Amino acid sequence: SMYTTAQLLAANEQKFKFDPLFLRLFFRESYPFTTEKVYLSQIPGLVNMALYVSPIVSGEVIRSRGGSTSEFTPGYVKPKHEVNPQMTLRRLPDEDPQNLADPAYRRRRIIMQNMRDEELAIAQVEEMQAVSAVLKGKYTMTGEAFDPVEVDMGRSEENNITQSGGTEWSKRDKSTYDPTDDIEAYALNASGVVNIIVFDPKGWALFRSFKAVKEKLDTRRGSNSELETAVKDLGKAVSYKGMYGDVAIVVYSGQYVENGVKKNFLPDNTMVLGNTQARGLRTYGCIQDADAQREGINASARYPKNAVTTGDPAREFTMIQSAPLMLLADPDEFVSVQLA
Amino acid sequence: SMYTTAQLLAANEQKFKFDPLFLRLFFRESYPFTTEKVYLSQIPGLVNMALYVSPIVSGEVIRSRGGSTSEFTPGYVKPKHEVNPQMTLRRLPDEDPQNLADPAYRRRRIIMQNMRDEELAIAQVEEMQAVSAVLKGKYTMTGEAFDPVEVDMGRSEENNITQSGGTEWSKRDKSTYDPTDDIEAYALNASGVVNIIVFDPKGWALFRSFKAVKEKLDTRRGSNSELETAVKDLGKAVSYKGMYGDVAIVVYSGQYVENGVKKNFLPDNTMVLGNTQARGLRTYGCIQDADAQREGINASARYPKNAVTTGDPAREFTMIQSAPLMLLADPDEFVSVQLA
Amino acid sequence: SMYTTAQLLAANEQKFKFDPLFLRLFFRESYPFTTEKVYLSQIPGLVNMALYVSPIVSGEVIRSRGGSTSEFTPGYVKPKHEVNPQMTLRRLPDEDPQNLADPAYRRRRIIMQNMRDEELAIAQVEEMQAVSAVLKGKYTMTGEAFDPVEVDMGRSEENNITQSGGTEWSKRDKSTYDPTDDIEAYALNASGVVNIIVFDPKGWALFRSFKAVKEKLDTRRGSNSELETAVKDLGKAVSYKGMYGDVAIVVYSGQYVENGVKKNFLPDNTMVLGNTQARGLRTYGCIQDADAQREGINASARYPKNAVTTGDPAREFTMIQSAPLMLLADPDEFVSVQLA
Amino acid sequence: SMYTTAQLLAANEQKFKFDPLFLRLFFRESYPFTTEKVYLSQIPGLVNMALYVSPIVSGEVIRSRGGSTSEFTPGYVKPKHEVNPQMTLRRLPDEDPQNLADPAYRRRRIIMQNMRDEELAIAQVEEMQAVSAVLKGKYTMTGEAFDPVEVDMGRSEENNITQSGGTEWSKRDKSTYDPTDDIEAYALNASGVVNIIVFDPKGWALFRSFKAVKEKLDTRRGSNSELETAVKDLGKAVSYKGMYGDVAIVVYSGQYVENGVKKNFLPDNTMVLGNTQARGLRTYGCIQDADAQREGINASARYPKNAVTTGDPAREFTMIQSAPLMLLADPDEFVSVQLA
């Protein structure tokens, strides 16, 4: 009658493997931990890596109370939906209209439709951490019954650049200026080589407005076959523009909803210099769930559940749990440039 | 014996799956509701979406008499045709000549011919809503015994662009001007990236007249195999021209007829910037039909009926009922440019 | 004894399924009527097409005495040959000479040779109607004891174009001029999109002579595998040149024999813009025939017969009867250009 | 004893399948006549077929006395070879001494080589008529006791062009002149389309010399299976390099000998614009052999014979009889111009 955590994990395989842009490109390692806290010493490498977690008071990061730690408990994300068979279901190919009126068949379809919405809600929380770690080397962590704190990965000052004092590309003459030298100087602050630049819509329009960029950029398709197939199913909000020399140009127009407001993952005039082989870690803390522990599921990135509430009245619901801790092993691998 | 709703839904699957261009590309999600009202709050992914429905008096939209809502009862389309045995059947290949004389074999094909003409009549209504929603973020909804109203889903003023005052492509130099800058500038108003542009015939003739487009457009077959597969059976009115950079170029020449007057879906000199992964919703209100309810068919996008009329038992008719409400989850995913 | 109509229909099925070019590509629907008269209102989707029939006197069309009609009785084509065992038989592969001495074997073989030639005579009449319907939107109908009339399908004047006043491709610079812009301008007159162009030999050589065409035309085999399959067995008079972007280029050098004189289907310097998904109808009036009525064959496109002339000194013959009426549902789907 | 007609046919099973190229490509219809005269009226599809026969004396054609005829007696050829002598054998590898002891095997091998040589010699007479039919539209045939005459099939003069002035490919500048426009202009004189051109080592080397030919040719095998099947049957080989757009480029290495001269099939290559679906007829006047009429062989393309005469031991011989008359239904389907 109730889907077990193992049954839901096997059904959500396709939706879980679908990763947003920044997670898919720069976070290619996953480390579920059997303990509630995440111990960075147990990850291969990263012997001296620490996380300076600072508590947030009054919406302002209070760094004086913060301290460096290699052990941390991530906040718990618990998207849940009540199971109502009378709710609308997305029509699937070759569905039987008479089955779609069976309340038992609609309950089966509602649970998996809820598993889709709950999965991408957790994937949004992971991508918010993913893009903020690349943009700033730090992000704000929230969670259920969790006081929001800032997780800092220790990015150098030189890796966060803002164009000012005449270096604004908007004030440069688009006809005769070549942004190559500026990008070369930005890329030197990166720990490794830079072979990809992720723009926002506005920053890309400014970047491509230069005549030297139009003449140099290879817009033809197949310029980077490895990257084009990695971003193929992300065409809704990701655009591969081409190769700018040995650097691949990508535009990220993704959005996330937070407190009922649509926000952009990338602020206006954003230019992120990075490496496709950068090391990002998807570490997950263990969520002690009685149903999961009884099924032998100790460490997992997702804890799907299909159960009823104990209180009266008994209402069936679905839920997926996760304790994500998206981290960059080397935050200086990226050079985040705020264009102006 | 009269054909039931479940049987006709089974035979119409081949014709019903044939979707017109805009419905097929941008409206890839169907949501039939179990109630007469369509509730936007139970559609996955929508966070407090509302429409503005204004009454239309004498062909004029009166927005002062309109109001916002998240629930709406769509107008019912009911294409009905009397089963006329005098209709000449299309001779099928390898068709047995003894079957041609059987009146039961003929009435089956005559009903299927009615089901075909009735399905494309509803598909024209849905495609009209779909095309007008992509062009203006709103459309006029009709229906059987239904006063016309304007269903507005809200498009920003910046996503509707008209070339004038020196920016019209017809007055540009076809040998030196590069429309690439205009497309990139127009694409900034989209919520996500742009990977497809749908032209009308005249807008395509103007766009490809530029020599910079002839040198850049990749017209080779297989340049965008996924899009070519989707528009393959639409060769009568849809033409895939190729890849213009990272953006595919499609020409839509579909047209409907009213009182013998041929009318195109897309106006003259129309350029629609959009995304192949854009989220359009095919919502349907439940049509409470006694025959459908008895067969356990509650929610459906089509309600085919084969019944006899009440005035004269000698008259037998067929009918397909539907309550379409084509909506765009984000009308700003598209940028409708009126070329000049 | 005498071969029945059903036996003759089964033997001639392969020869009947073999269609000339314009019938095979543009007239993919057949509608045999059980009544001697063809009723346009009984055909699905012919609300927007009207027939204007004018009489012909001294080979000159008189439109002033012509009028519209929704009902039509086509002329009767009745190719007949007498069966004489003196005819020389085509030596088939693996044929047995012991059968050649059998009088019944030679009788069957000669009847089949007559059925082949008689089918070609009717297929020529249909292709004549098909070619002229595509070229002009009208054709001249003949028949036994049938006064010739012009069947006009009401093509717009904009869809018949003649190059004149500097527009002639022959007066253009073959080294620098691009005929693409002219073709795109011509295609704007079509109801839908244009994905096929049918040239005559002379008009193709003029279109081939431009250097911009030699660089743009993809002549590789397999460029349009579905169209190459359709014209594979027509290699005598049909040549597939390749894909001109998204438009297939076909050359038609077919000839029809009228009054013992071979005549080309297409006039010199002919360029026909069209669509492979265009709706062409092969309507056939009923022919009351005793041998066809014996098998319950009321409506048919062919009426084969093997009978002996009663009242005359022992004359055995064969005959196939037909009342063809080829129609274009929308003659504006084609743009017929008379090059110069 | 003497070998049955079926016994030599089982030996000439695969040997009669092999056929010279021009007969294999353009003469797929065999019409063996039961009368000594051939009657072109008794062949289906021939629209008033006539042959202009002219008597030839002292090596010159007198067309003043000739007249168009529909009937014609083909000259009969009967190559014969004596059987069962002690003549020096033919060298064939992988032959053991076990077959040197049986005198019947050597006699058996003598019949096969004679049947092959006689079947070849008649096949050469037909190819002389065939090659000359598509090259000149007229030919002179020989006979056992026949009076030589010219057989003119009415080839149009326009299909027999002669290069003069600047049309010579040697006078034209190499790599500055495209042979396409010549081949397309010469093809306008053909009745249908041209999908094959025949070459030879001398003229194909001139055609492959142009740089523009190298890129447009498809050297990969599998382009035309029927064409590659003909190149494989010949051990000494007769090859074609591949497709040339829609036209096939074939090279013929076969040669013949007429009387005492070793005149070639065609000088250099000229231009052989042909169609693989062109209609050519293999018309055979019947040869009256008493043993053939006794076996029921009234009309046949080949009259094979294995009989014995007189002597002690009696003289044995083999003979294949045929009265071939190779004709082109439409000689204007080919264009032959003198090329240098």
Short mmCIF file of C-alpha atoms in Angstrom, two decimals, chain A:
data_model
loop_
_atom_site.label_atom_id
_atom_site.label_comp_id
_atom_site.label_asym_id
_atom_site.label_seq_id
_atom_site.Cartn_x
_atom_site.Cartn_y
_atom_site.Cartn_z
CA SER A 1 0.00 0.00 0.00
CA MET A 2 2.86 2.37 0.90
CA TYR A 3 5.93 2.71 -1.30
CA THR A 4 9.09 1.81 0.58
CA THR A 5 12.10 4.12 0.55
CA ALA A 6 13.92 1.61 -1.66
CA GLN A 7 11.03 1.50 -4.13
CA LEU A 8 10.94 5.29 -4.43
CA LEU A 9 14.72 5.57 -4.79
CA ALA A 10 14.66 3.21 -7.78
CA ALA A 11 11.77 5.06 -9.42
CA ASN A 12 13.39 8.50 -8.97
CA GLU A 13 16.63 7.46 -10.69
CA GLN A 14 16.04 9.50 -13.86
CA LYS A 15 14.90 12.66 -12.08
CA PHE A 16 17.78 12.47 -9.59
CA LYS A 17 20.43 12.08 -12.31
CA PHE A 18 19.14 15.24 -14.04
CA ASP A 19 21.42 17.93 -12.61
CA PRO A 20 21.29 21.72 -13.09
CA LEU A 21 24.11 23.52 -14.93
CA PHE A 22 26.54 24.41 -12.14
CA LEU A 23 26.05 21.08 -10.35
CA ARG A 24 26.53 19.09 -13.55
CA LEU A 25 29.65 20.96 -14.71
CA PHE A 26 31.63 21.62 -11.52
CA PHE A 27 30.25 19.15 -8.93
CA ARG A 28 31.05 15.72 -10.39
CA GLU A 29 31.72 13.97 -7.05
CA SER A 30 29.12 12.81 -4.52
CA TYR A 31 29.95 11.79 -0.94
CA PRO A 32 27.03 10.57 1.19
CA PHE A 33 28.09 10.16 4.82
CA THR A 34 26.67 7.66 7.30
CA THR A 35 26.98 10.23 10.11
CA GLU A 36 24.83 13.30 10.68
CA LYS A 37 27.84 15.61 10.50
CA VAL A 38 29.99 15.82 7.37
CA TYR A 39 33.65 15.13 8.16
CA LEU A 40 35.87 16.67 5.48
CA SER A 41 38.87 14.60 6.59
CA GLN A 42 37.20 11.39 5.35
CA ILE A 43 37.03 12.67 1.75
CA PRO A 44 40.02 11.74 -0.47
CA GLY A 45 42.44 14.63 -0.41
CA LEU A 46 41.32 17.84 1.29
CA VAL A 47 43.52 17.28 4.34
CA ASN A 48 43.68 20.96 5.31
CA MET A 49 40.27 22.09 4.02
CA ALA A 50 38.03 23.80 6.57
CA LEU A 51 34.70 25.63 6.52
CA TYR A 52 34.42 28.95 8.36
CA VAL A 53 30.74 28.83 9.34
CA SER A 54 29.40 32.13 10.68
CA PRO A 55 25.94 32.58 12.24
CA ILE A 56 23.60 35.05 10.56
CA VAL A 57 21.84 37.56 12.81
CA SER A 58 19.43 40.23 11.53
CA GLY A 59 19.99 39.08 7.96
CA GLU A 60 23.66 40.12 8.28
CA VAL A 61 26.54 37.65 8.40
CA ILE A 62 28.18 37.82 11.84
CA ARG A 63 31.74 36.61 11.23
CA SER A 64 33.10 37.38 14.71
CA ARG A 65 31.06 34.54 16.21
CA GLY A 66 32.09 32.26 13.35
CA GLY A 67 34.78 29.62 13.54
CA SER A 68 36.65 27.28 11.24
CA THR A 69 35.43 23.68 11.35
CA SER A 70 35.97 20.49 9.36
CA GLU A 71 32.74 18.97 10.75
CA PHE A 72 29.30 20.40 10.04
CA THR A 73 25.65 19.35 10.04
CA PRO A 74 23.85 20.51 6.88
CA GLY A 75 20.33 21.85 7.10
CA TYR A 76 17.56 19.41 6.26
CA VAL A 77 15.39 20.01 3.18
CA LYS A 78 11.99 18.30 3.46
CA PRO A 79 9.63 19.09 0.56
CA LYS A 80 6.32 17.34 1.17
CA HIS A 81 2.93 17.12 -0.52
CA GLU A 82 -0.41 15.73 0.60
CA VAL A 83 -1.62 12.89 -1.62
CA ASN A 84 -4.98 13.80 -3.17
CA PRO A 85 -5.97 11.55 -6.11
CA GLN A 86 -8.48 14.16 -7.32
CA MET A 87 -5.69 16.61 -8.20
CA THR A 88 -4.76 17.05 -11.85
CA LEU A 89 -2.19 14.70 -13.38
CA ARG A 90 0.05 15.45 -16.34
CA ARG A 91 -1.07 13.27 -19.24
CA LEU A 92 1.55 10.64 -20.06
CA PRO A 93 1.88 8.89 -23.44
CA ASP A 94 -0.65 6.10 -23.99
CA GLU A 95 -2.62 6.57 -20.78
CA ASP A 96 -5.98 4.87 -20.31
CA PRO A 97 -8.82 7.37 -19.67
CA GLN A 98 -10.69 4.80 -17.57
CA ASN A 99 -7.62 4.17 -15.40
CA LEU A 100 -7.18 7.93 -14.97
CA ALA A 101 -10.55 7.94 -13.17
CA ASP A 102 -9.65 5.06 -10.83
CA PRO A 103 -8.80 6.65 -7.44
CA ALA A 104 -6.21 3.91 -6.81
CA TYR A 105 -4.53 4.60 -10.15
CA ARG A 106 -4.51 8.37 -9.58
CA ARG A 107 -2.86 7.87 -6.18
CA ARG A 108 -0.02 6.00 -7.90
CA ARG A 109 0.32 8.86 -10.40
CA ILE A 110 0.10 11.56 -7.71
CA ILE A 111 2.93 10.03 -5.66
CA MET A 112 5.36 9.97 -8.58
CA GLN A 113 4.28 13.43 -9.72
CA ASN A 114 4.99 14.60 -6.17
CA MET A 115 8.37 12.83 -6.31
CA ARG A 116 9.21 14.93 -9.37
CA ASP A 117 8.31 18.25 -7.74
CA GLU A 118 10.08 17.34 -4.49
CA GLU A 119 13.23 16.23 -6.33
CA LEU A 120 13.67 19.47 -8.27
CA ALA A 121 12.98 21.44 -5.08
CA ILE A 122 15.98 19.75 -3.46
CA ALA A 123 17.96 20.14 -6.70
CA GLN A 124 17.23 23.87 -6.55
CA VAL A 125 18.63 24.05 -3.01
CA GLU A 126 21.76 22.27 -4.24
CA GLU A 127 22.10 24.53 -7.29
CA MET A 128 21.66 27.67 -5.17
CA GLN A 129 24.65 26.51 -3.12
CA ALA A 130 26.47 25.49 -6.30
CA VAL A 131 26.17 28.87 -8.04
CA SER A 132 26.90 30.87 -4.88
CA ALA A 133 30.03 28.84 -4.13
CA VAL A 134 31.28 29.63 -7.64
CA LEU A 135 30.20 33.29 -7.53
CA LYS A 136 31.53 34.15 -4.07
CA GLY A 137 33.13 31.10 -2.46
CA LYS A 138 30.39 31.19 0.19
CA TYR A 139 26.63 30.80 0.53
CA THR A 140 23.81 30.97 3.06
CA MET A 141 22.51 27.62 4.31
CA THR A 142 18.89 27.23 5.43
CA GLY A 143 16.81 24.25 6.51
CA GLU A 144 13.89 22.97 8.51
CA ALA A 145 14.23 24.02 12.17
CA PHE A 146 17.64 25.43 11.22
CA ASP A 147 19.08 28.86 11.98
CA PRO A 148 20.52 30.26 8.73
CA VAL A 149 24.33 30.45 8.66
CA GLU A 150 26.98 31.31 6.09
CA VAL A 151 29.32 28.57 4.86
CA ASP A 152 32.58 30.16 3.69
CA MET A 153 35.10 28.21 1.62
CA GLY A 154 37.87 30.81 1.80
CA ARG A 155 38.07 32.41 -1.64
CA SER A 156 40.92 34.86 -2.16
CA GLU A 157 40.17 38.54 -2.67
CA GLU A 158 41.77 38.51 -6.14
CA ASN A 159 39.24 35.91 -7.35
CA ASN A 160 36.28 38.30 -6.84
CA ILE A 161 36.71 41.22 -9.25
CA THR A 162 34.36 44.14 -9.89
CA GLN A 163 34.95 46.43 -12.85
CA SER A 164 35.40 50.00 -11.61
CA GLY A 165 37.57 53.06 -12.14
CA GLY A 166 37.42 53.07 -15.94
CA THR A 167 37.63 49.30 -16.47
CA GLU A 168 33.86 49.01 -17.02
CA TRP A 169 33.26 47.22 -20.32
CA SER A 170 30.09 49.27 -20.81
CA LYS A 171 32.22 52.43 -21.02
CA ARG A 172 34.71 50.91 -23.48
CA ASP A 173 34.45 51.68 -27.19
CA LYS A 174 32.81 48.57 -28.65
CA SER A 175 34.35 49.21 -32.08
CA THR A 176 38.05 49.20 -31.15
CA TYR A 177 38.35 47.56 -27.71
CA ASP A 178 39.41 43.93 -27.31
CA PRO A 179 38.41 42.26 -24.02
CA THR A 180 41.07 39.58 -24.51
CA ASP A 181 43.67 41.27 -22.29
CA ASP A 182 41.14 41.82 -19.49
CA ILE A 183 40.07 38.16 -19.54
CA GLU A 184 43.71 37.05 -19.57
CA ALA A 185 44.37 39.12 -16.44
CA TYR A 186 41.27 37.76 -14.71
CA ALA A 187 42.17 34.17 -15.60
CA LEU A 188 45.60 34.47 -13.96
CA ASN A 189 43.90 34.69 -10.55
CA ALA A 190 42.46 31.20 -11.11
CA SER A 191 44.35 28.29 -9.56
CA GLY A 192 44.07 26.24 -12.76
CA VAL A 193 43.63 26.91 -16.45
CA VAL A 194 40.43 28.62 -17.59
CA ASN A 195 38.56 26.89 -20.42
CA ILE A 196 34.96 28.01 -19.80
CA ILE A 197 33.23 31.33 -19.10
CA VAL A 198 29.62 31.38 -17.88
CA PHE A 199 27.74 34.61 -18.62
CA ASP A 200 24.33 35.88 -17.67
CA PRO A 201 22.10 37.22 -20.47
CA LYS A 202 23.10 40.86 -19.90
CA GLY A 203 26.82 40.16 -19.43
CA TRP A 204 26.90 38.10 -22.62
CA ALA A 205 25.24 40.88 -24.63
CA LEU A 206 27.91 43.29 -23.37
CA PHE A 207 30.68 40.77 -24.06
CA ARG A 208 29.53 40.05 -27.62
CA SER A 209 28.95 43.73 -28.43
CA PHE A 210 32.69 44.19 -29.01
CA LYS A 211 33.76 43.88 -32.65
CA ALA A 212 36.87 41.95 -31.59
CA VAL A 213 34.64 39.37 -29.88
CA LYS A 214 32.37 38.86 -32.91
CA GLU A 215 35.39 38.28 -35.16
CA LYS A 216 37.04 35.86 -32.71
CA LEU A 217 34.09 33.83 -31.41
CA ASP A 218 33.37 30.54 -33.21
CA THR A 219 29.57 30.36 -33.23
CA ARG A 220 29.35 27.24 -35.42
CA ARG A 221 27.99 24.12 -33.77
CA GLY A 222 30.20 21.20 -32.84
CA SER A 223 32.90 23.57 -31.56
CA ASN A 224 32.93 21.77 -28.18
CA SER A 225 31.20 18.41 -28.60
CA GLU A 226 31.99 17.31 -25.03
CA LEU A 227 30.33 20.42 -23.59
CA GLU A 228 27.43 20.64 -26.04
CA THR A 229 26.17 17.15 -25.14
CA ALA A 230 26.61 17.93 -21.43
CA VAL A 231 24.28 20.95 -21.72
CA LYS A 232 21.96 19.55 -24.41
CA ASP A 233 18.93 18.86 -22.20
CA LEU A 234 19.44 22.21 -20.40
CA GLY A 235 18.42 24.32 -23.41
CA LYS A 236 15.59 26.02 -21.51
CA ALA A 237 18.00 28.22 -19.55
CA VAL A 238 21.51 27.29 -20.79
CA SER A 239 22.98 28.39 -24.12
CA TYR A 240 26.33 27.37 -25.61
CA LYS A 241 27.58 30.32 -27.64
CA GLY A 242 30.82 28.83 -28.93
CA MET A 243 34.58 28.84 -28.43
CA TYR A 244 36.37 32.09 -27.56
CA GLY A 245 39.84 30.86 -28.42
CA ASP A 246 40.47 27.96 -26.05
CA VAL A 247 37.65 29.11 -23.72
CA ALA A 248 34.04 27.98 -24.09
CA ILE A 249 31.32 30.63 -23.75
CA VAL A 250 28.17 29.59 -21.87
CA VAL A 251 25.13 31.70 -20.93
CA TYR A 252 23.13 30.79 -17.82
CA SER A 253 19.62 32.23 -17.57
CA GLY A 254 18.41 29.82 -14.90
CA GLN A 255 15.96 30.85 -12.22
CA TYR A 256 14.90 29.66 -8.79
CA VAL A 257 11.79 30.47 -6.75
CA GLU A 258 12.32 31.54 -3.13
CA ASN A 259 9.62 32.88 -0.79
CA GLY A 260 7.26 33.08 -3.77
CA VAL A 261 9.56 35.28 -5.87
CA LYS A 262 11.39 34.32 -9.06
CA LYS A 263 15.11 35.10 -8.82
CA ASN A 264 18.02 34.63 -11.21
CA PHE A 265 20.88 32.31 -10.29
CA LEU A 266 23.30 34.83 -11.83
CA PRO A 267 23.11 38.57 -11.09
CA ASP A 268 23.21 41.08 -13.92
CA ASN A 269 26.49 41.49 -15.84
CA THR A 270 28.07 38.34 -14.41
CA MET A 271 31.18 36.77 -15.96
CA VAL A 272 32.48 33.63 -14.26
CA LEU A 273 35.86 32.31 -15.38
CA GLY A 274 36.34 28.66 -14.47
CA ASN A 275 37.51 25.16 -15.39
CA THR A 276 35.36 22.26 -16.54
CA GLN A 277 37.56 19.86 -14.54
CA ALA A 278 37.15 21.80 -11.28
CA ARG A 279 36.62 19.66 -8.18
CA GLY A 280 33.26 20.19 -6.49
CA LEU A 281 31.91 17.92 -3.78
CA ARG A 282 28.28 16.95 -3.21
CA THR A 283 28.55 15.86 0.41
CA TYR A 284 25.38 14.78 2.21
CA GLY A 285 24.73 14.35 5.91
CA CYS A 286 22.86 11.31 7.17
CA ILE A 287 19.19 11.89 7.96
CA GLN A 288 18.14 9.34 10.58
CA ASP A 289 14.75 8.23 9.24
CA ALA A 290 13.12 5.26 10.94
CA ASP A 291 11.73 3.93 7.65
CA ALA A 292 15.08 4.41 5.90
CA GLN A 293 17.13 2.87 8.72
CA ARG A 294 14.75 -0.10 8.86
CA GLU A 295 15.39 -0.60 5.12
CA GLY A 296 19.17 -0.46 5.62
CA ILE A 297 19.39 2.94 3.90
CA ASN A 298 21.90 4.81 6.07
CA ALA A 299 23.79 7.23 3.79
CA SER A 300 21.94 8.67 0.80
CA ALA A 301 21.54 11.94 -1.07
CA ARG A 302 17.74 11.46 -1.08
CA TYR A 303 15.35 10.01 1.52
CA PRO A 304 11.99 9.55 -0.23
CA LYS A 305 9.03 8.65 1.96
CA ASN A 306 5.40 7.66 1.37
CA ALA A 307 3.55 7.42 4.69
CA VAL A 308 0.58 8.76 6.65
CA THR A 309 0.57 11.21 9.54
CA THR A 310 0.03 9.78 13.01
CA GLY A 311 -2.30 12.51 14.24
CA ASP A 312 -6.01 12.51 13.53
CA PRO A 313 -7.02 12.57 10.78
CA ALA A 314 -4.56 10.21 9.08
CA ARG A 315 -3.47 11.94 5.85
CA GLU A 316 -1.25 10.26 3.28
CA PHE A 317 1.71 12.32 2.12
CA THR A 318 4.97 12.07 0.18
CA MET A 319 8.34 13.57 1.06
CA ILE A 320 11.99 13.53 0.00
CA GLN A 321 14.68 14.43 2.53
CA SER A 322 18.27 15.56 2.00
CA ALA A 323 21.12 17.25 3.88
CA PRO A 324 23.16 18.72 1.01
CA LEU A 325 26.56 20.33 1.57
CA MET A 326 27.73 21.54 -1.85
CA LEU A 327 31.40 22.49 -1.52
CA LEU A 328 34.28 23.54 -3.76
CA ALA A 329 37.58 21.85 -2.95
CA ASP A 330 39.42 24.89 -4.36
CA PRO A 331 37.25 28.05 -4.53
CA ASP A 332 40.11 29.91 -6.26
CA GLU A 333 39.64 27.64 -9.29
CA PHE A 334 36.98 30.16 -10.35
CA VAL A 335 37.35 33.89 -11.01
CA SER A 336 34.03 35.70 -10.60
CA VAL A 337 33.93 39.05 -12.42
CA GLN A 338 31.13 41.57 -11.85
CA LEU A 339 30.92 43.45 -15.14
CA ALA A 340 29.78 47.07 -15.21
#
